[PDB]
Every structure is written in structure tokens, then in C-alpha cells.
Amino acid sequence: SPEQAMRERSELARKGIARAKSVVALAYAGGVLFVAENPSRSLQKISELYDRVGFAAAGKFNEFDNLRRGGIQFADTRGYAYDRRDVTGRQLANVYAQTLGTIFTEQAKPYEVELCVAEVAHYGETKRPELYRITYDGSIADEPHFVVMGGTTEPIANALKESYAENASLTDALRIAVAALRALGVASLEVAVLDANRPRRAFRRITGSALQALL
Amino acid sequence: SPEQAMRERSELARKGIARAKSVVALAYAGGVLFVAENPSRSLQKISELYDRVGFAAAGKFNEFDNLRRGGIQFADTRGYAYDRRDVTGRQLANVYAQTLGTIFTEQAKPYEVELCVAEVAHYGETKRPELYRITYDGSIADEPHFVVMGGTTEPIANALKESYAENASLTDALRIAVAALRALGVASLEVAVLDANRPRRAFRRITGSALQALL
């Protein structure tokens, strides 16, 4: 039956989401921190979307990567038509959800992906970081503190639940995030920030020797 | 069921990959060395892709040959739009994987092919050779030392594991590669190099009397 088929599809999607590297995103004093478990040096699961909007994903690389590209596309055209400060994390979070739902209903296989869109305030302004999680069906959830995506999310989510502290510095939030992620080695870690203090482009990767010194 | 069908497709692809001539690619002092077991004199399994990017394949000739052509196509147009030094082995390796995955999902029969994209540094620059292996599904793997494609890959991969030496000269790497490939005769061998010392076009075939003298 159709209902049975739908249930099977949901189970398949869940399985796909489960067998994947884990990513975390959490708010800290200077903005938002993305920490993903990533062995490759070329393939990335964290990306700039717009001036103050970042993006992390977990699942099947070609698909989440494809969404990455679609999201980049929409923001630039919108900004050109109206302006940079008009594109918000909210509008982008919304677009992905609608697209995902329609796509799943009309396509063959559902995207085994889990998305997190992050936004911080502009330069010289005060506002709390916003985290949204978009799931494979189109559901969207507003997160106040942190998002955990891919793999087994329960232990990481709980460890973060005990260790999280608002207004933690960059080093403390990095320790908390790596610790809860372990529930690792300097190599194979993809770390980036949405630094609210930057004048325009807030996204900034933290790689190599500096990262080693921090950890 | 669909899952069962997918498993059957994977098995079929594996069988196709298995019944084929073996190719090896390995890093040596002057760049990268391709050594394939090829009886025909007209049909080739090693090819120039761009100035410093080479290509080897194993499987069904018409298909791997077709990818060869598609890859050649993309690089020239890209270079004309931006420039020669902008096309990299990484971008090409990526394109094939995405295309293969989409193609397999929407087509009838999966491409019974296995690809290896190789890149060396430009003239007067220092950088390690990069080898990527792209499999029939779209998976891509970053190899530090050597790639073995087609046929029974275990014995050749192990023999190379014992014999490999970084910064081996051209003759030593040729002996190692032919020896591990045997795990043959002067005839029916397709040998080419990505010589890092050439000014622009790095790919260069090694055929006939010179090859005989070397071996």
C-alpha cells in the first residue's frame, strides 16, 4: 500500500541519516561554531552561504553538496535584486524545506540529508545567534543553543546538554564541542566559525597550526 | 524489491569491473607513471586530459572511452573561459563522480568502469603528485602512492605495497609496476608518464625501442 511504501521510505531515509559523520553547531560569545568529523581534505561539510549565514550538513555528500550550491545560487541573485542585508538565515532555511518536501514527493529517492542553517548579527549590532535544523522531509526546527546532525545524535546531544555554557569563549566552546563529539585527533577535523566581529563576511575556517595551538 | 534490485546492480557492476585488464598508476621522482596491460595497438586506456592532468581507466572500452571524451571537453571550455592553470585534477575528478552517480540513478545499465585521475605540479614548482580513484557509483578516493584498477586488484596492490619506494627513478618504478602487474612481454604494454619536468604538456607516451631498452 501507499502508506506502507511511505513508511518504508521514511525508514530508508532514517538509515541513510544514521550511517554518517557527526556535525555540531553551537552558539558562543563571538558567534556560531561548526565542528564536524571529516577525514578528507578536499570534501567539506561546512560552508559560507552569505555574508552572515553559514551552513552545515550531514548525509550523502553529492546531495547535501548540491543543496549547498542551490543555496549559494539563491542568495546572490536575491541580493543583487534587492540588497545584501535583505537575505536572512530565515528565508534560506525556509527555501530548503519547501524544496525538499516537493522534491521528495515528486522524485524517486529522498535526500538522505540533514541541514543546519546558521545566522549571526551584522557588525556593530546586538542579536542572538539563530540556528535552524531542516530534516529530509521538509521539517524545520528553531534551536536556541546547538544543533547535532548525522550519526548517533543522542550521546553527543546529551554531552552538549551538560557542558553547554552561553557566552563561552572560542576555546571553551571548541573543547566542549570536540568532547561531546567524541561521545578526537588533530587530523580529520573540519572547524569553522561565524565570527560576529568581522565587518562583512563572517564565515572563517580554523585549520592547521592555529587549530592545533588552540587544542 | 528495489533494495534487492540495487544489490543485483552492484553485483553486476562488480562482475563487469572484475573481468578486465589491469592498470596501475604510481608516483615516482619525475611525476606519475601509468602502466596498463593492453594488447591492441589502436585502443588505449591512458590519456592526456589537460596540461598536467592525466587519466587511466579500466572496464568497458566504449564507456570509459566516452568519459575520456567528456573529460577532455570540459577542461578546454573551462580553460578558455578562465585559464589553463585554473583547471585542476581535483575539479575534473569531482565532475566524473557526480556525473556517474546521476547517470547511474537515471540510466538503465551502470558504467562498468573504474577511473583514475592524476595530477602533477607545474614547471618550476614543488608539489606532490595527486592520484584520485573514481568508482562506478560516484565514490572518490584520494591515494597517496598508487592506484590499481580492473581485474583482480589484491595481488597487484600487495606486490606494490612491498616494492613501492618514493622518489624511485623512472626505470625502477617501471620495473616495480610491471613486476606487480604480473602477480610481462615487451609487446602489448601501454606505458605513459606525467613528466613534471616538461614545460607545459606533461603527458608523454613511452613506446617501442626506447621502452624495450628501458626494460
Binding site: 541513510g16 559523520k21 571529516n38 578528507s40 570534501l43 550531514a58 | 568508482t135 560516484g138 565514490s139 572518490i140
Partner: peptide, 4 residues
């Protein structure tokens, strides 16, 4: 393959 290459799940991530």
C-alpha cells in the same frame, strides 16, 4: 559509497 563514500557516505559522509
Amino acid at each position: 559509497g563514500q557516505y559522509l
